[PDB]
Amino acid sequence: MVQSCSAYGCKNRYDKDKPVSFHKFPLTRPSLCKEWEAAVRRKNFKPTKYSSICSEHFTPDSFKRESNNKLLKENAVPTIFLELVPR
DNA sequence: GCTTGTGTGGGCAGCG
DNA sequence: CGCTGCCCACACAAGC
């Protein structure tokens, strides 16, 4: 969301000082959308996929419509969400 | 090239 | 009081 991504505590709230854009889940690529679930391994699972996510969580390749045709790389999903657990 | 579709961008209510 | 769940309008890219 705007407040923060579905990651594990990514309070990366829109900060122009930080190089990130704000995208929505790959709604239209549900199967692939679903692995995002897996990377959102947070107990208190953040919003669904209508909320938005920021760029730092995926590979630049898979960023968005700039991928292959008009959406992500269907074989890529946010993997940069978080290392293990914040302190 | 312009219009339409999908992505982009952000919000409100109830309980620790 | 903030967070989670779901929706609309505009610009860019494709079609006519």
XYZ file of N, CA, C and O (backbone and C1' of nucleotides) in Angstrom:
571
model
N 0.849 -1.205 0.000
C 0.000 0.000 0.000
C 0.874 1.239 0.000
O 2.092 1.133 -0.094
N 0.244 2.403 0.140
C 0.967 3.667 0.178
C 1.735 3.747 1.471
O 2.903 4.125 1.499
N 1.035 3.385 2.539
C 1.602 3.363 3.871
C 2.886 2.536 3.862
O 3.911 2.971 4.389
N 2.816 1.351 3.251
C 3.971 0.461 3.144
C 3.607 -0.787 2.339
O 2.423 -1.071 2.121
N 4.631 -1.534 1.907
C 4.429 -2.709 1.062
C 3.983 -3.854 1.960
O 3.947 -3.767 3.183
N 3.664 -4.944 1.243
C 3.190 -6.199 1.800
C 4.355 -7.033 2.340
O 4.161 -8.150 2.813
N 5.567 -6.489 2.199
C 6.794 -7.137 2.676
C 6.781 -7.417 4.187
O 5.736 -7.600 4.805
N 7.960 -7.406 4.795
C 8.072 -7.685 6.207
C 8.548 -6.423 6.913
O 9.682 -6.345 7.385
N 7.680 -5.420 6.942
C 8.009 -4.182 7.610
C 8.675 -3.144 6.722
O 9.523 -2.378 7.188
N 8.291 -3.096 5.449
C 8.878 -2.164 4.501
C 8.193 -0.801 4.511
O 7.359 -0.501 3.654
N 8.483 -0.003 5.527
C 7.946 1.343 5.598
C 8.690 2.226 4.606
O 9.323 3.208 5.005
N 8.612 1.914 3.323
C 9.312 2.701 2.311
C 8.421 3.790 1.731
O 8.611 4.162 0.570
N 7.414 4.215 2.512
C 6.440 5.262 2.116
C 7.019 6.203 1.064
O 8.158 6.655 1.214
N 6.209 6.529 0.041
C 6.648 7.363 -1.083
C 7.593 8.468 -0.657
O 7.204 9.461 -0.041
N 8.836 8.257 -1.014
C 9.907 9.173 -0.733
C 10.650 9.342 -2.039
O 11.319 8.432 -2.513
N 10.476 10.512 -2.615
C 11.107 10.885 -3.874
C 12.632 10.835 -3.770
O 13.345 10.754 -4.772
N 13.113 10.861 -2.538
C 14.538 10.818 -2.271
C 15.055 9.416 -2.525
O 16.231 9.207 -2.826
N 14.142 8.464 -2.419
C 14.446 7.060 -2.634
C 13.941 6.655 -4.019
O 12.824 6.997 -4.413
N 14.767 5.952 -4.792
C 14.393 5.562 -6.148
C 13.436 4.370 -6.253
O 13.859 3.261 -6.584
N 12.154 4.585 -5.967
C 11.174 3.510 -6.094
C 9.823 4.023 -6.614
O 9.406 5.146 -6.317
N 9.179 3.189 -7.426
C 7.859 3.470 -7.999
C 6.811 2.640 -7.260
O 7.178 1.743 -6.490
N 5.520 2.895 -7.478
C 4.520 2.150 -6.723
C 3.530 1.266 -7.504
O 2.584 1.774 -8.095
N 3.725 -0.028 -7.529
C 2.915 -0.893 -8.400
C 1.916 -1.743 -7.696
O 2.048 -2.029 -6.544
N 0.937 -2.191 -8.434
C -0.042 -3.064 -7.840
C 0.310 -4.529 -8.088
O 1.183 -4.807 -8.913
N -0.310 -5.459 -7.383
C -0.010 -6.877 -7.592
C -0.267 -7.274 -9.045
O -1.054 -6.624 -9.741
N 0.367 -8.361 -9.526
C 0.164 -8.857 -10.893
C -1.153 -9.623 -10.925
O -1.215 -10.837 -11.100
N -2.203 -8.835 -10.744
C -3.578 -9.280 -10.664
C -4.012 -10.230 -11.743
O -4.761 -11.190 -11.565
N -3.470 -9.864 -12.884
C -3.723 -10.470 -14.167
C -2.813 -11.662 -14.470
O -2.896 -12.289 -15.525
N -1.942 -11.950 -13.511
C -1.069 -13.104 -13.559
C -1.217 -13.788 -12.213
O -0.253 -13.936 -11.478
N -2.448 -14.233 -11.900
C -2.794 -14.817 -10.608
C -1.852 -15.906 -10.114
O -1.411 -15.857 -8.979
N -1.572 -16.903 -10.941
C -0.676 -17.979 -10.542
C 0.627 -17.389 -10.013
O 1.057 -17.691 -8.899
N 1.177 -16.460 -10.763
C 2.412 -15.805 -10.399
C 2.148 -14.883 -9.224
O 2.987 -14.713 -8.343
N 0.934 -14.365 -9.175
C 0.525 -13.469 -8.122
C 0.567 -14.240 -6.829
O 0.971 -13.732 -5.790
N 0.186 -15.500 -6.921
C 0.092 -16.373 -5.796
C 1.434 -16.726 -5.188
O 1.496 -17.028 -3.996
N 2.523 -16.691 -5.941
C 3.772 -17.017 -5.271
C 4.168 -15.856 -4.418
O 4.890 -16.029 -3.435
N 3.654 -14.676 -4.767
C 3.950 -13.499 -3.984
C 3.495 -13.821 -2.575
O 4.137 -13.385 -1.619
N 2.471 -14.676 -2.447
C 1.951 -15.021 -1.144
C 3.067 -15.552 -0.261
O 3.288 -15.145 0.878
N 3.770 -16.502 -0.911
C 4.901 -17.233 -0.362
C 5.996 -16.313 0.127
O 6.643 -16.595 1.137
N 6.199 -15.219 -0.547
C 7.242 -14.308 -0.149
C 6.726 -13.336 0.897
O 7.504 -12.712 1.621
N 5.408 -13.264 1.015
C 4.770 -12.468 2.052
C 4.533 -13.373 3.274
O 3.451 -13.411 3.853
N 5.567 -14.131 3.627
C 5.531 -15.091 4.749
C 5.282 -14.443 6.125
O 5.460 -15.085 7.160
N 4.866 -13.189 6.138
C 4.589 -12.482 7.380
C 3.296 -13.008 8.007
O 2.291 -13.144 7.313
N 3.332 -13.315 9.308
C 2.150 -13.822 10.022
C 0.968 -12.892 9.806
O -0.113 -13.313 9.388
N 1.184 -11.625 10.111
C 0.160 -10.628 9.933
C 0.212 -10.142 8.497
O 0.644 -9.022 8.230
N -0.146 -11.043 7.577
C -0.156 -10.747 6.145
C -0.800 -9.386 5.878
O -1.933 -9.120 6.285
N -0.011 -8.532 5.236
C -0.400 -7.186 4.826
C -1.622 -7.232 3.883
O -2.264 -8.269 3.777
N -2.025 -6.104 3.249
C -3.161 -6.084 2.308
C -3.116 -7.255 1.321
O -2.150 -8.004 1.228
N -4.153 -7.325 0.502
C -4.220 -8.266 -0.600
C -3.468 -7.574 -1.703
O -2.647 -6.689 -1.500
N -3.846 -7.973 -2.896
C -3.196 -7.555 -4.113
C -3.799 -6.296 -4.734
O -3.323 -5.837 -5.769
N -4.856 -5.747 -4.146
C -5.365 -4.491 -4.651
C -4.423 -3.434 -4.117
O -4.264 -2.413 -4.779
N -3.826 -3.589 -2.956
C -2.834 -2.594 -2.544
C -1.659 -2.615 -3.529
O -1.559 -3.475 -4.409
N -0.753 -1.661 -3.339
C 0.404 -1.504 -4.193
C 1.695 -1.908 -3.444
O 1.718 -2.031 -2.221
N 2.762 -2.118 -4.214
C 4.057 -2.576 -3.723
C 5.137 -1.666 -4.339
O 4.880 -1.058 -5.371
N 6.324 -1.545 -3.739
C 7.366 -0.709 -4.328
C 8.500 -1.558 -4.958
O 8.745 -2.704 -4.577
N 9.150 -0.941 -5.940
C 10.186 -1.538 -6.819
C 11.313 -2.354 -6.178
O 11.676 -3.405 -6.708
N 11.830 -1.916 -5.051
C 12.967 -2.564 -4.387
C 12.769 -4.051 -4.088
O 13.724 -4.770 -3.808
N 11.529 -4.498 -4.148
C 11.191 -5.883 -3.824
C 11.354 -6.867 -4.985
O 11.397 -8.078 -4.753
N 11.447 -6.383 -6.211
C 11.582 -7.285 -7.351
C 12.793 -6.923 -8.156
O 13.452 -5.918 -7.898
N 13.081 -7.742 -9.139
C 14.196 -7.496 -9.990
C 13.804 -6.458 -11.013
O 12.674 -6.460 -11.499
N 14.712 -5.534 -11.318
C 14.483 -4.477 -12.302
C 13.918 -5.020 -13.610
O 13.074 -4.399 -14.255
N 14.348 -6.230 -13.927
C 13.884 -6.936 -15.120
C 12.366 -7.086 -15.062
O 11.647 -6.811 -16.021
N 11.907 -7.520 -13.899
C 10.510 -7.838 -13.624
C 9.711 -6.694 -13.038
O 8.558 -6.873 -12.659
N 10.356 -5.549 -12.945
C 9.743 -4.334 -12.398
C 8.245 -4.198 -12.713
O 7.437 -4.050 -11.790
N 7.873 -4.242 -13.999
C 6.460 -4.092 -14.393
C 6.256 -4.274 -15.897
O 6.826 -5.176 -16.495
N 5.462 -3.387 -16.502
C 5.143 -3.455 -17.934
C 6.389 -3.367 -18.816
O 6.336 -3.689 -20.004
N 7.504 -2.950 -18.233
C 8.760 -2.816 -18.963
C 9.483 -4.162 -19.026
O 10.616 -4.251 -19.502
N 8.812 -5.205 -18.527
C 9.355 -6.557 -18.514
C 9.457 -7.123 -19.942
O 10.366 -6.775 -20.697
N 8.530 -8.001 -20.302
C 8.528 -8.622 -21.615
C 7.507 -7.986 -22.540
O 7.863 -7.346 -23.527
N 6.229 -8.179 -22.230
C 5.162 -7.643 -23.068
C 4.475 -6.443 -22.429
O 4.646 -5.314 -22.884
N 3.709 -6.673 -21.372
C 2.992 -5.583 -20.729
C 2.913 -5.752 -19.212
O 2.316 -4.927 -18.529
N 3.511 -6.810 -18.686
C 3.492 -7.052 -17.246
C 4.842 -7.615 -16.801
O 5.772 -7.573 -17.583
N 4.918 -8.189 -15.574
C 6.193 -8.692 -15.007
C 6.713 -9.849 -15.844
O 6.154 -10.219 -16.878
N 7.800 -10.440 -15.339
C 8.319 -11.672 -15.895
C 7.580 -12.762 -15.135
O 7.853 -12.942 -13.959
N 6.607 -13.386 -15.748
C 5.783 -14.424 -15.090
C 6.544 -15.535 -14.346
O 5.939 -16.379 -13.684
N 7.850 -15.526 -14.466
C 8.707 -16.463 -13.738
C 9.505 -15.729 -12.649
O 10.544 -16.202 -12.185
N 9.012 -14.561 -12.275
C 9.620 -13.710 -11.242
C 8.520 -13.102 -10.389
O 7.433 -12.743 -10.838
N 8.896 -13.030 -9.108
C 8.084 -12.540 -8.004
C 9.021 -11.912 -6.955
O 10.170 -12.346 -6.836
N 8.565 -10.857 -6.230
C 9.344 -10.188 -5.177
C 10.000 -11.251 -4.322
O 9.348 -12.092 -3.707
N 11.313 -11.172 -4.298
C 12.143 -12.048 -3.513
C 13.007 -11.208 -2.557
O 13.603 -11.732 -1.614
N 13.020 -9.889 -2.777
C 13.848 -8.974 -1.994
C 13.068 -8.415 -0.797
O 13.548 -7.519 -0.107
N 11.849 -8.926 -0.581
C 10.972 -8.452 0.507
C 11.718 -8.185 1.809
O 11.543 -7.125 2.404
N 12.520 -9.150 2.247
C 13.288 -9.022 3.483
C 14.223 -10.210 3.644
O 13.960 -11.292 3.115
N 15.292 -9.996 4.390
C 16.294 -11.025 4.642
C 15.719 -12.143 5.510
O 15.513 -13.261 5.042
N 15.453 -11.832 6.773
C 14.904 -12.814 7.697
C 13.871 -12.162 8.604
O 12.677 -12.420 8.480
N 14.331 -11.307 9.504
C 13.441 -10.633 10.430
C 14.090 -9.352 10.946
O 15.271 -9.343 11.291
N 13.336 -8.240 10.947
C 13.833 -6.955 11.422
C 13.929 -6.910 12.944
O 13.300 -7.714 13.635
N 14.680 -5.954 13.466
C 14.857 -5.829 14.906
C 14.364 -4.469 15.400
O 15.160 -3.506 15.431
O -0.060 10.131 -34.075
C -0.718 11.104 -34.892
C -2.182 11.208 -34.536
C -2.474 11.335 -33.044
O -3.735 11.973 -32.818
C -3.148 9.193 -33.794
P -4.225 12.259 -31.313
O -5.515 11.340 -31.160
C -6.689 11.607 -31.921
C -7.813 10.684 -31.512
C -8.096 10.662 -30.012
O -9.455 10.293 -29.761
C -7.115 8.606 -30.646
P -9.994 10.210 -28.250
O -10.360 8.671 -28.087
C -11.197 8.037 -29.052
C -11.469 6.602 -28.665
C -11.776 6.395 -27.186
O -12.546 5.208 -26.988
C -9.647 5.496 -27.668
P -12.977 4.776 -25.502
O -12.183 3.415 -25.286
C -12.321 2.346 -26.219
C -11.636 1.104 -25.704
C -11.871 0.820 -24.224
O -11.722 -0.575 -23.960
C -9.632 1.500 -24.540
P -11.901 -1.128 -22.465
O -10.464 -1.725 -22.130
C -9.904 -2.745 -22.958
C -8.644 -3.309 -22.343
C -8.714 -3.541 -20.837
O -7.801 -4.560 -20.436
C -7.274 -1.715 -21.283
P -7.717 -4.982 -18.889
O -6.246 -4.542 -18.476
C -5.128 -4.970 -19.252
C -3.837 -4.535 -18.602
C -3.808 -4.712 -17.088
O -2.455 -4.876 -16.659
C -3.910 -2.406 -17.594
P -2.108 -4.958 -15.094
O -1.151 -3.699 -14.911
C -0.051 -3.517 -15.805
C 0.721 -2.258 -15.480
C 0.935 -2.021 -13.989
O 2.067 -1.188 -13.743
C -0.604 -0.432 -14.814
P 2.430 -0.771 -12.235
O 2.041 0.772 -12.197
C 2.527 1.668 -13.196
C 2.223 3.094 -12.809
C 2.446 3.372 -11.331
O 2.693 4.757 -11.096
C 0.132 3.412 -11.793
P 3.004 5.255 -9.605
O 1.560 5.629 -9.050
C 1.046 6.936 -9.265
C 0.252 7.411 -8.070
C 0.807 6.940 -6.728
O 0.457 7.859 -5.695
C -1.227 5.821 -7.150
P 0.773 7.501 -4.161
O -0.698 7.481 -3.560
C -1.622 8.448 -4.033
C -2.914 8.422 -3.252
C -2.756 8.176 -1.754
O -3.842 8.762 -1.046
C -3.732 6.271 -2.742
P -3.970 8.548 0.538
O -5.333 7.742 0.619
C -6.419 8.134 -0.216
C -7.732 7.767 0.427
C -7.755 7.959 1.938
O -9.091 8.217 2.383
C -7.767 5.639 1.426
P -9.375 8.516 3.935
O -10.307 7.303 4.362
C -11.512 7.037 3.648
C -12.347 6.025 4.397
C -12.439 6.251 5.902
O -13.660 5.699 6.408
C -11.098 4.346 5.465
P -14.038 5.876 7.963
O -14.108 4.386 8.515
C -15.036 3.455 7.956
C -15.020 2.157 8.729
C -15.113 2.294 10.243
O -15.696 1.105 10.790
C -12.926 1.595 9.647
P -16.028 1.022 12.361
O -15.108 -0.170 12.877
C -15.463 -1.521 12.588
C -14.567 -2.482 13.335
C -14.508 -2.280 14.845
O -14.178 -3.517 15.491
C -12.449 -1.616 13.883
P -14.073 -3.578 17.092
O -12.561 -4.005 17.358
C -12.141 -5.342 17.087
C -10.707 -5.563 17.514
C -10.393 -5.213 18.971
O -9.306 -6.006 19.496
C -9.395 -3.613 17.534
P -8.951 -5.938 21.075
O -7.381 -5.652 21.205
C -6.555 -6.708 21.711
C -5.081 -6.527 21.403
C -4.310 -5.442 22.158
O -2.971 -5.809 22.513
C -4.560 -4.684 19.956
P -6.621 7.855 18.925
O -5.633 7.834 17.672
C -4.306 8.334 17.818
C -3.314 7.517 17.020
C -3.504 7.520 15.504
O -2.249 7.261 14.857
C -4.097 5.393 16.347
P -2.158 7.223 13.251
O -1.713 5.724 12.945
C -0.586 5.156 13.617
C -0.365 3.724 13.184
C -0.404 3.484 11.678
O 0.340 2.307 11.355
C -2.329 2.539 12.663
P 0.458 1.831 9.827
O -0.297 0.430 9.821
C 0.006 -0.562 10.801
C -0.771 -1.828 10.525
C -0.800 -2.273 9.066
O -1.020 -3.683 8.975
C -2.940 -1.469 9.693
P -0.918 -4.421 7.550
O -2.390 -4.965 7.278
C -2.889 -6.066 8.036
C -4.287 -6.447 7.604
C -4.451 -6.840 6.137
O -5.603 -7.683 5.999
C -5.478 -4.746 6.508
P -5.980 -8.314 4.567
O -7.212 -7.432 4.078
C -8.532 -7.718 4.532
C -9.545 -7.315 3.488
C -9.180 -7.653 2.048
O -10.357 -7.789 1.253
C -9.038 -5.312 2.360
P -10.234 -8.104 -0.318
O -10.879 -6.812 -0.972
C -12.096 -6.304 -0.452
C -12.541 -5.092 -1.230
C -12.364 -5.213 -2.741
O -13.321 -4.410 -3.419
C -10.786 -3.659 -1.901
P -13.300 -4.331 -5.021
O -12.994 -2.787 -5.240
C -13.726 -1.842 -4.466
C -13.775 -0.491 -5.140
C -13.891 -0.537 -6.661
O -14.531 0.642 -7.144
C -11.739 0.228 -6.066
P -14.698 0.871 -8.722
O -13.884 2.219 -8.947
C -14.114 3.326 -8.082
C -13.517 4.587 -8.657
C -13.723 4.752 -10.160
O -13.706 6.137 -10.507
C -11.444 4.289 -9.727
P -13.909 6.583 -12.036
O -12.532 7.304 -12.376
C -12.055 8.344 -11.527
C -10.823 8.997 -12.107
C -10.882 9.266 -13.609
O -10.015 10.356 -13.925
C -9.341 7.528 -13.200
P -9.786 10.787 -15.454
O -8.221 10.550 -15.636
C -7.312 11.108 -14.688
C -5.878 10.944 -15.136
C -5.641 11.175 -16.626
O -4.298 11.614 -16.857
C -5.386 8.870 -16.141
P -3.800 11.924 -18.355
O -2.619 10.878 -18.559
C -1.535 10.839 -17.630
C -0.512 9.806 -18.040
C -0.087 9.864 -19.503
O 1.220 9.303 -19.646
C -1.397 7.927 -19.151
P 1.914 9.241 -21.091
O 2.028 7.675 -21.360
C 2.650 6.824 -20.394
C 2.748 5.407 -20.911
C 3.172 5.296 -22.370
O 3.783 4.025 -22.608
C 0.896 4.688 -22.167
P 4.352 3.678 -24.069
O 3.417 2.480 -24.544
C 3.354 1.279 -23.780
C 2.547 0.221 -24.497
C 2.810 0.112 -25.995
O 2.509 -1.214 -26.440
C 0.664 1.033 -25.652
P 2.635 -1.589 -27.997
O 1.152 -2.031 -28.371
C 0.483 -2.998 -27.564
C -0.880 -3.332 -28.121
C -0.949 -3.533 -29.632
O -2.058 -4.382 -29.947
C -2.034 -1.506 -29.064
P -2.351 -4.795 -31.472
O -3.761 -4.110 -31.753
C -4.860 -4.351 -30.876
C -6.127 -3.737 -31.424
C -6.322 -3.919 -32.925
O -7.712 -3.852 -33.248
C -5.838 -1.653 -32.467
P -8.194 -4.077 -34.762
O -8.769 -2.649 -35.167
C -9.748 -2.014 -34.347
C -10.262 -0.754 -35.001
C -10.521 -0.871 -36.500
O -11.510 0.071 -36.909
C -8.623 0.500 -36.126
